[PDB]
Design a protein around this nucleic acid. Sequence first.
DNA 1: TCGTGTCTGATATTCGATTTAAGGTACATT
DNA 2: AAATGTACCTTAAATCGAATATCAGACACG
Lengths: 183, 180
Amino acid sequence: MRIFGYARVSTSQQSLDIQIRALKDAGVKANRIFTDKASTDREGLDLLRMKVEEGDVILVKKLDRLGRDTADMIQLIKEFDAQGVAVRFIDDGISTDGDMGQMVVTILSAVAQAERRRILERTNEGRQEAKLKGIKFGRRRTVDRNVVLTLHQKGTGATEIAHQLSIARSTVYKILEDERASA
Amino acid sequence: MRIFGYARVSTSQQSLDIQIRALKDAGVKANRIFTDKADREGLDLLRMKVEEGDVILVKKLDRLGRDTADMIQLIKEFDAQGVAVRFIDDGISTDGDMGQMVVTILSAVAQAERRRILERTNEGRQEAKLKGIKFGRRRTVDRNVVLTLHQKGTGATEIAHQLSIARSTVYKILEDERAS
DNA sequence: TCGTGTCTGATATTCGATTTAAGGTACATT
DNA sequence: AAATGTACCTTAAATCGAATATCAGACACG
């Protein structure tokens, strides 16, 4: 019944020390904590993979701090559950053990195979070149592209369209470049 | 307590008929089944018809949304209406006992992948908090005026009407400067 | 001197979960 | 009836870094 913990960041040392301090207050010994930072340097996680034994429990601050994605996360959770090793996520109040633990691993296994079949879908038609994150980032497009394309198609010069729609001349070329690359 | 079901494919009509046949073997009426193909119109019609207490039968999880994020978004949207979803093959239900547990965990899964994208952002925010950078809204209210008037014995309602602020705002300001 | 392409850097948003400020309601009290 | 405190809940800005759009010129060439 050994207690372990894991913490992962990209760069920041402070937010890493935040997790470590949380694990230490959770009753995890200092030597029982493994960490990583960004090549794929997982050595802290790999060392945890080695040391863990049946009956051992691994404490993690949040779900996002485990895998590099949803797939990797469940892949890891399954890996520890196979060995009887339980994972408890502190802030989210979730565990792979106790009572609901099996239900936890069950639904986690469902979405895993579900998205794996979704990967099998995308792979056939093709997606990955696109790489959809799902969150909308950046300034919204306020410019009507259709008007720009139509005018230029009629032979209207670059500076004439820019003066027409009150955009920059460079903006016109960016629009023409984006739609040309699209075609 | 009406029974509904959903089936989704990309191209193949055969795999669609498989789901439909499976839904009908589960005791769903023929007019209670909605389908879509690569056009969410069938799913949108389902969103409209459903009411609190109704349950939806789906063959598998992957047959719901276009990705994991969309799926959880849908399930949350139905759970918000009290509508439940039971996946046949995966053996998972959003009602009864496990119901809260399903929504709770799927919420954590979704919020985790978003926080994964925000990793470098919210870490830089933690270093910013460390530097002492002030978060939250900036104070537009002069604290001196509020505290000076109150020192002379001006009532709370009067200061509020004076500076055109809220009454509870004055108390909160007095509380902050007293506690420190 | 002027218009056209190609290019880089500077502004401008917009995101999500969190964090403080302010507005607002509700209840009990004086 | 009116003003006074006290207790939480909604809006309302404001945060980081990354991502997307637009602006503003520079530079070379005919």
